[PDB]
Design a protein around this ligand. Structure first.
Ligand SMILES: *[C@@H]1O[C@H](CO)[C@@H](O[C@@H]2O[C@H](CO)[C@@H](O[C@@H]3O[C@H](CO[C@H]4O[C@H](CO[C@H]5O[C@H](CO)[C@@H](O)[C@H](O)[C@@H]5O)[C@@H](O)[C@H](O)[C@@H]4O)[C@@H](O)[C@H](O[C@H]4O[C@H](CO)[C@@H](O)[C@H](O)[C@@H]4O[C@H]4O[C@H](CO)[C@@H](O)[C@H](O)[C@@H]4O[C@H]4O[C@H](CO)[C@@H](O)[C@H](O)[C@@H]4O)[C@@H]3O)[C@H](O)[C@H]2NC(C)=O)[C@H](O)[C@H]1NC(C)=O
Ligand SMILES: *[C@@H]1O[C@H](CO)[C@@H](O[C@@H]2O[C@H](CO)[C@@H](O[C@@H]3O[C@H](CO[C@H]4O[C@H](CO[C@H]5O[C@H](CO)[C@@H](O)[C@H](O)[C@@H]5O)[C@@H](O)[C@H](O[C@H]5O[C@H](CO)[C@@H](O)[C@H](O)[C@@H]5O)[C@@H]4O)[C@@H](O)[C@H](O[C@H]4O[C@H](CO)[C@@H](O)[C@H](O)[C@@H]4O[C@H]4O[C@H](CO)[C@@H](O)[C@H](O)[C@@H]4O)[C@@H]3O)[C@H](O)[C@H]2NC(C)=O)[C@H](O)[C@H]1NC(C)=O
Ligand SMILES: *[C@@H]1O[C@H](CO)[C@@H](O[C@@H]2O[C@H](CO)[C@@H](O[C@@H]3O[C@H](CO[C@H]4O[C@H](CO)[C@@H](O)[C@H](O)[C@@H]4O)[C@@H](O)[C@H](O[C@H]4O[C@H](CO)[C@@H](O)[C@H](O)[C@@H]4O[C@H]4O[C@H](CO)[C@@H](O)[C@H](O)[C@@H]4O)[C@@H]3O)[C@H](O)[C@H]2NC(C)=O)[C@H](O)[C@H]1NC(C)=O
Ligand SMILES: *[C@@H]1O[C@H](CO)[C@@H](O[C@@H]2O[C@H](CO)[C@@H](O[C@@H]3O[C@H](CO[C@H]4O[C@H](CO)[C@@H](O)[C@H](O)[C@@H]4O)[C@@H](O)[C@H](O[C@H]4O[C@H](CO)[C@@H](O)[C@H](O)[C@@H]4O)[C@@H]3O)[C@H](O)[C@H]2NC(C)=O)[C@H](O)[C@H]1NC(C)=O
Ligand SMILES: *[C@@H]1O[C@H](CO)[C@@H](O[C@@H]2O[C@H](CO)[C@@H](O[C@@H]3O[C@H](CO)[C@@H](O)[C@H](O[C@H]4O[C@H](CO)[C@@H](O)[C@H](O)[C@@H]4O)[C@@H]3O)[C@H](O)[C@H]2NC(C)=O)[C@H](O)[C@H]1NC(C)=O
Ligand SMILES: *[C@@H]1O[C@H](CO)[C@@H](O[C@@H]2O[C@H](CO)[C@@H](O[C@@H]3O[C@H](CO)[C@@H](O)[C@H](O[C@H]4O[C@H](CO)[C@@H](O)[C@H](O)[C@@H]4O)[C@@H]3O)[C@H](O)[C@H]2NC(C)=O)[C@H](O)[C@H]1NC(C)=O
Ligand SMILES: *[C@@H]1O[C@H](CO)[C@@H](O[C@@H]2O[C@H](CO)[C@@H](O[C@@H]3O[C@H](CO)[C@@H](O)[C@H](O)[C@@H]3O)[C@H](O)[C@H]2NC(C)=O)[C@H](O)[C@H]1NC(C)=O
Ligand SMILES: *[C@@H]1O[C@H](CO)[C@@H](O[C@@H]2O[C@H](CO)[C@@H](O[C@@H]3O[C@H](CO)[C@@H](O)[C@H](O)[C@@H]3O)[C@H](O)[C@H]2NC(C)=O)[C@H](O)[C@H]1NC(C)=O
Ligand SMILES: *[C@@H]1O[C@H](CO)[C@@H](O[C@@H]2O[C@H](CO)[C@@H](O[C@@H]3O[C@H](CO)[C@@H](O)[C@H](O)[C@@H]3O)[C@H](O)[C@H]2NC(C)=O)[C@H](O)[C@H]1NC(C)=O
Ligand SMILES: *[C@@H]1O[C@H](CO)[C@@H](O[C@@H]2O[C@H](CO)[C@@H](O)[C@H](O)[C@H]2NC(C)=O)[C@H](O)[C@H]1NC(C)=O
Ligand SMILES: *[C@@H]1O[C@H](CO)[C@@H](O[C@@H]2O[C@H](CO)[C@@H](O)[C@H](O)[C@H]2NC(C)=O)[C@H](O)[C@H]1NC(C)=O
Ligand SMILES: *[C@@H]1O[C@H](CO)[C@@H](O[C@@H]2O[C@H](CO)[C@@H](O)[C@H](O)[C@H]2NC(C)=O)[C@H](O)[C@H]1NC(C)=O
Ligand SMILES: *[C@@H]1O[C@H](CO)[C@@H](O)[C@H](O)[C@H]1NC(C)=O
Lengths: 134, 494, 135, 135, 50, 50
């Protein structure tokens, strides 16, 4: 089906290199768009209960909140003032897949999230002061 | 001109009533089903704001009472039902007469003199009092034995067994029967079916923090002058979760309390004379309880595939007792002094006229004490401890209460209701082997009663739930409303 | 922990006055950012564990965000609105007044202000559609 | 009540024609404001009550936002799109046609139009970022 | 009480009262004729009109 | 027999005509053997709530 390929079309980028990788918005949005439809279909007539049905909702709001948490919702590339961590880990945009490098940065990924969260708050505070002034 | 403006993220809050997630550390079976595993953080931040706090009219406090009782309900629901064993049990006549269940006593009762000497006995761990019971006497016996048939799972044949109850677990039918067998039922098997406690509840201490869901915060009043009804806190600290809390139920006292402190602060319920007092951890007010005789448990099957833990032991050890120990009399007097200076209490200031006494008897629930340790409850007279703590004239009731001792006698009851909320009736299995339980006293349940300008009483009370009002008394639950509306001359424009 | 301080960092401004108070947008977003993480953590191994409040945790978030979407001020610290202020005696003291100390004074007319601004956005909403349709 | 009139106001223009109709954005947002408090109110004191349909109210709301955001036109009454019109025989009558009436005529081809736009947005989604990556 | 801890209500009454009855009351005959007349003029019902 | 599962306790419940079926036969005793109307097909519950 179109939905099956559609959900399975995003992962086709996996083989592609980082530089040639085609970033795709709507990946999570469309997946929950039809999954709810699939379960809704014939439902009118835990797995059936809310053991996992909300978990999909929880997963969706997690990423959506994270984007709003960092103030970069709906921006495939938002530049931020945070400086780069240890420079030994540098992506090889020519011959590196996303996961071949995502796993390596996963060791320091948590610190980047914690460091970036504080940075947004600092920039956030400046916006309020400027708005309050004028 | 001025126009309304909307602000998001403003730090404000308000009262709220939402359920809470429970977190526990030693989750034998109650973890991942009702409570998450613990996180282990207790950092709090002080704020320069004032807020009102109450210990009785608190959502967190009320829920804690409900959750403990609700948790116990799920534990006993699948356990076995003891309906079948409500049948006449042949019993030893010579043994039921001694404790007065039948009340069949004839002649005897010879006159005897009373020495009425010394009776200032005191005990500490080095002595031989602890090791062998044997402590001045009055610790003699407590047991009864009977018989019943109770055909098992194979619904074709019976198998007579023996089980030994205690004195306060049976009601016997008085009659003119001369037979050596005394027909006698259970205590409450003609009122409602009682179900066992065939679990590890009451067999180990239970602790669990309280964590509010996201979008709700907990506030604590850190002022050392907190009494319970003070709506002005100089020091207030915000937190993500509460501290631990002991879930032990007892009367006249509260053991293993986490809120022990060097100061003898008092939590007062201003709306009436309900009171709770926290002792000091400076006098080492430890108390140790022991019951002698190492026991054997013989499970018996009934017609449901389940097992009823009996005690066919024929031994006759001495009854249970506790010796308290530590520096008590010097410790108690500090409580009385604190009451004098505490706000409210427009009463006398004579320290040696304010006296700590038990309520006016009546039902056994309030007359005796009640302490639970490692699955077997104990209720004790507590007259001697009260007699020795104040050193009063020993003209109280019969000669049995003349003595001033640091230890008191106790007995065992097995058909016990959960005192927590209202009622019910459950059966506590007996523990194999010997039991010795040691605890530290860190609270006091008492209602202060005085009608005149003289002779105020620190009267004990049997409200078990009052303990939970000491653990989280200073906690408040507040819902965060990050929306703030204030005027601004600026307009929306275009 | 950082999350404990981070979740408790929003209220650090409660002691400051309105004028000197530093606003903290995204606070609720960060509050739910780690709340599910704590709930999710060790979950892999009556309503508390179940969905008596878990949906309420979701519900609280959607209500607040849907509140902004209804008023058209999402993702903005301050949004000037065409509605005028009500009875003006309750003037905030921006020098020596905390947010909470004054939120209660205006709480009496808070409900009425809610209704008034909701209609205003609809009227502005209607104007936007008419302009777009024209052009 | 205001909520009863407010919630039912969406269909107030249902009788109007296509052009003369005044579109009402925030209908789901405003409804989610007042519908939930009805459940929340007095709840402090099987499926319909707790979780079978309560989440379905949430599930319904997210569907519009997820459907909207997948198409990249959230918070916009009208967004022009590159996709050409399908078979043009079903020309709208802007003078004497109602929205639901005309919607029933498009329901036959409604499913196919949905697929076409989703692919179209992906193409623009690939191009819009790649230009940023390019420069 | 039965062998479950619960109660079963009983009626040990020995006196014999008169049997139950209901007397309706009100203008009824006039009512049913109006029901009959409505059926005559009701759409459908390809039937008699007497 | 009641909750105390060691003895019997006779009651009387006064049923109605349309809630009993009685055995027909040549018995002469003044006592008539009858059962409940529908207890040989299923177990009946009591409208126990209000
Ligand atoms: C106020 O707080 C006070 C402080 O906590 C309370 O007093 C304390 O209460 C706790 C209980 O919450 C007691 O701990 C328990 O003690 C049990 C008995 O301990 C005996 O053995 C001790 C010697 O053991 C030493 O070594 C072990 C291992 O290193 C160490 O843990 C222990 O501390 C000690 O150093 C001896 O010193 C004692 O005097 C006793 O003779 C003990 O069994 C308990 O462990 C249980 O439970 C835990 C979970 O809580 C399990 O992880 C364990 O594996 C163990 O479980 C086994 O034993 C249970 C009890 O016997 C059984 O029910 C289980 O089924 C299980 O296995 C049984 O079945 C097997 C089948 O093959 C058999 O082979 C086994 O032998 C078992 O029969 C727990 O540690 C404290 O001792 C106590 N302290 C004091 C000073 O009293 C106080 O009670 C509180 N207030 C009130 C009012 O109660
Ligand atoms: C959120 O949570 C917080 C907690 O975290 C909640 O805080 C609690 O909120 C409740 C309700 O808002 C408060 O209860 C109210 O308290 C006031 C104040 O009580 C103190 O002051 C009294 C002052 O009275 C004297 O002074 C006045 C002049 O100011 C004179 O006119 C009087 O004659 C008196 O001289 C004082 O009397 C009180 O004494 C009490 O306590 C002492 C010990 O300190 C005892 O010895 C006394 O016996 C007595 O118990 C106290 O010191 C009370 O005044 C309020 O009572 C009125 O309202 C009651 C409920 O309607 C009613 O039953 C009372 O009879 C009384 O009636 C008044 O109101 C009626 C209705 O309007 C009138 O018809 C009537 O004529 C009279 O005017 C009330 O009890 C809590 O104090 C507060 N804090 C705590 C810790 O609970 C908060 O409410 C929650 N919600 C929100 C939104 O925040
Ligand atoms: C409420 O709580 C208070 C607080 O404890 C409690 O106060 C105690 O009251 C008792 C009396 O019932 C007091 O006991 C008396 O103490 C005095 C004072 O003596 C002090 O100094 C001597 C040294 O000179 C010390 O050895 C002593 O311990 C005290 O510190 C004594 O003089 C009293 O003497 C008794 O014995 C005499 C014979 O030796 C008698 O002649 C005399 O009348 C007293 O008789 C009483 O005690 C006899 C002891 O054998 C007994 O046989 C009698 O029948 C009679 O009871 C007496 O010892 C005690 O000190 C107070 N302690 C404190 C801290 O205040 C209240 O009693 C209590 N009340 C209620 C109602 O609960
Ligand atoms: C905790 O427990 C203590 C005692 O252990 C209680 O203390 C008592 O509190 C009551 C409060 O009602 C006191 O009663 C008050 O007495 C005052 C003294 O004046 C006269 O009082 C009565 C007549 O009212 C006379 O008989 C007496 O001889 C005095 O001449 C009165 O001013 C008060 O009057 C108010 O209440 C009465 C009803 O009680 C009304 O009719 C009046 O109109 C007026 O409103 C009151 O009567 C009592 O004296 C206290 N006991 C003492 C001092 O020993 C605490 O109250 C209790 N805690 C709580 C929260 O109740
Ligand atoms: C930036 O990132 C790079 C990439 O990791 C990092 O270089 C790495 O540093 C670690 C040390 O932190 C190195 O780890 C060593 O690995 C060798 C084997 O390759 C081991 O023999 C070493 O053992 C010694 O050190 C241990 C650490 O305590 C001792 O316990 C042990 O007894 C030995 O003394 C050591 O583990 C690692 O090899 C490099 N390289 C790589 C590719 O990881 C660099 O330090 C980072 N710089 C900054 C500023 O962040
Ligand atoms: C774009 O959509 C329009 C609207 O449907 C379409 O033209 C219309 O098609 C319908 C049916 O699809 C036609 O309805 C006709 O009704 C008569 C009876 O009144 C029937 O006899 C017709 O059957 C013939 O036509 C069919 C296709 O029209 C054939 O498939 C069939 O085998 C018969 O030959 C038919 O049901 C209607 O008349 C037309 N015209 C209008 C409404 O003006 C148009 O074809 C679509 N564009 C395409 C497909 O490129
Ligand atoms: C509890 O009930 C059990 C039965 O289920 C009792 O077991 C009985 O115990 C008595 C006393 O030990 C046994 O008496 C025996 O008598 C013979 C006579 O020759 C003697 O040789 C034995 O050494 C023994 O003393 C009896 O046989 C035994 N019966 C069974 C079936 O086991 C038990 O005694 C009861 N507990 C008491 C009374 O405390
Ligand atoms: C503080 O404790 C004392 C000690 O118990 C209380 O005194 C007791 O008060 C009750 C109630 O009045 C008395 O009950 C009756 O006493 C009479 C004799 O006065 C007796 O004949 C009755 O049978 C009944 O028992 C009790 O006797 C009395 N006890 C003593 C030793 O005096 C006092 O009331 C308590 N304080 C307050 C404020 O209640
Ligand atoms: C069934 O219901 C009837 C009530 O209609 C109960 O009958 C009553 O039974 C008692 C004894 O159980 C009778 O008391 C005795 O009556 C005799 C009559 O001669 C008298 O001599 C005795 O001294 C004693 O008073 C009572 O009269 C009788 N009442 C009637 C028949 O109207 C009957 O008990 C119920 N069946 C049960 C409880 O099994
Ligand atoms: C509570 O303490 C805070 C500081 O933690 C006070 O905040 C300061 O208040 C003074 C008052 O003049 C201002 O000048 C400062 O700008 C405020 N901020 C700081 C960082 O000092 C607050 O005023 C105190 N409130 C009360 C009621 O004591
Ligand atoms: C009530 O019980 C006593 C004690 O059991 C009975 O006393 C007996 O009386 C009979 C004569 O009536 C004597 O033969 C017995 O020796 C007495 N003792 C015992 C133990 O039986 C008394 O008879 C009973 N009263 C009754 C049944 O009405
Ligand atoms: C069924 O019961 C009736 C009533 O008791 C019996 O009627 C008697 O039948 C015998 C013959 O079997 C006659 O001789 C009697 O005259 C009948 N009447 C009486 C009052 O006894 C009938 O017999 C029974 N059916 C049998 C026994 O098969
Ligand atoms: C308290 O005792 C004193 C001294 O005996 C007495 O004068 C006073 O009346 C007593 N109090 C009351 C309320 O009677």
């Amino acid at each position: 089906g179109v939905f099956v390929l559609g959900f399975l079309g995003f992962l086709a980028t996996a083989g592609s290199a980082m530089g040639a990788a085609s970033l795709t918005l709507t990946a999570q949005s469309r997946t929950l768009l039809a999954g709810i439809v699939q379960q809704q279909q014939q439902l009118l007539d835990g797995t059936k209960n809310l053991q996992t049905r909300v978990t999909a909702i929880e997963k969706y709001l997690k990423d959506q909140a994270q984007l709003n948490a960092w103030g970069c919702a709906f921006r495939q590339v938002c530049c931020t003032t945070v400086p780069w961590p240890n420079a030994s880990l540098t992506p090889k945009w020519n011959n590196e897949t996303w996961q071949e490098w995502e796993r390596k940065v996963d060791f320091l990924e948590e610190n980047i999230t914690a460091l970036l969260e504080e940075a947004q708050i600092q920039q956030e505070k400046n916006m309020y002061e400027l708005q309050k002034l004028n | 001109t001025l126009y309304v403006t909307v602000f998001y993220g403003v730090p404000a809050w308000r009262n709220a009533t939402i359920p809470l997630f429970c977190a526990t550390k030693n989750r034998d079976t109650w973890g991942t089903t009702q409570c998450l595993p613990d996180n282990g953080d207790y950092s709090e931040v002080a704020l320069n704001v004032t807020e009102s706090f109450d210990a009785w009219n608190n959502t967190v406090t009320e829920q804690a009472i409900e959750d403990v009782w609700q948790l116990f309900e799920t534990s006993i629901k699948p356990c076995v039902k003891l309906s079948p064993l409500c049948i006449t049990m042949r019993c030893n006549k010579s043994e039921t007469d001694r404790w007065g269940l039948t009340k069949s006593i004839t002649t005897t009762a010879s006159t005897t003199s009373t020495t009425a000497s010394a009776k200032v006995d005191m005990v500490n761990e080095t002595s031989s009092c602890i090791a062998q019971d044997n402590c001045t006497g009055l610790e003699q016996e407590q047991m009864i034995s009977c018989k019943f048939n109770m055909t098992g799972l194979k619904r074709d044949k019976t198998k007579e067994y023996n089980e030994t109850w205690y004195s306060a677990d049976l009601v016997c039918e008085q009659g003119n029967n001369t037979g050596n067998e005394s027909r006698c039922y259970m205590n409450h098997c003609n009122t409602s079916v009682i179900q066992e406690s065939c679990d590890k509840h009451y067999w180990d201490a239970i602790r669990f923090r309280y964590c509010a869901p996201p979008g709700y915060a907990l506030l604590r009043c850190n002022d050392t002058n907190y009494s319970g009804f003070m709506p002005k806190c100089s020091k207030v600290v915000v937190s993500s979760c509460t501290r631990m809390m002991e879930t032990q139920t007892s009367t006249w006292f509260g053991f293993n309390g986490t809120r022990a402190e060097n100061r003898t602060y008092i939590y007062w319920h201003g709306r009436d004379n309900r009171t709770i007092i926290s002792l000091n951890k400076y006098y080492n007010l430890t108390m140790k309880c022991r019951r002698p005789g190492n026991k054997t448990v013989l499970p018996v099957t009934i017609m449901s595939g389940l097992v009823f833990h009996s005690q066919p032991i024929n031994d006759r050890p001495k009854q249970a007792w506790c010796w308290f120990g530590g520096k008590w009399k010097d410790a108690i007097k500090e409580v009385k002094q604190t009451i004098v200076k505490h706000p409210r209490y427009t009463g006398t200031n004579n320290t040696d006229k304010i006296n700590l006494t038990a309520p006016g008897g009546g039902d056994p629930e309030v007359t005796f004490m009640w302490t639970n340790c490692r699955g077997e409850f104990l209720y004790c007279k507590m007259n001697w401890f009260l007699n020795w703590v104040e050193d009063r004239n020993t003209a109280n009731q019969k000669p049995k209460e003349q003595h001033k001792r640091n230890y008191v006698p106790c007995h065992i009851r097995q058909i016990i209701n959960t005192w927590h909320k209202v009622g019910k009736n459950v059966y506590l299995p007996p523990r194999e082997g010997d039991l010795t339980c040691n605890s530290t006293v860190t609270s006091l349940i008492a209602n202060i009663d005085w009608i005149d300008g003289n002779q105020t009483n620190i009267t004990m009370s049997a409200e078990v739930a009052e303990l939970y009002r000491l653990e989280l008394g200073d906690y408040k639950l507040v819902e965060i409303t990050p929306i703030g509306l204030a005027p601004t001359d600026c307009k929306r424009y275009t």
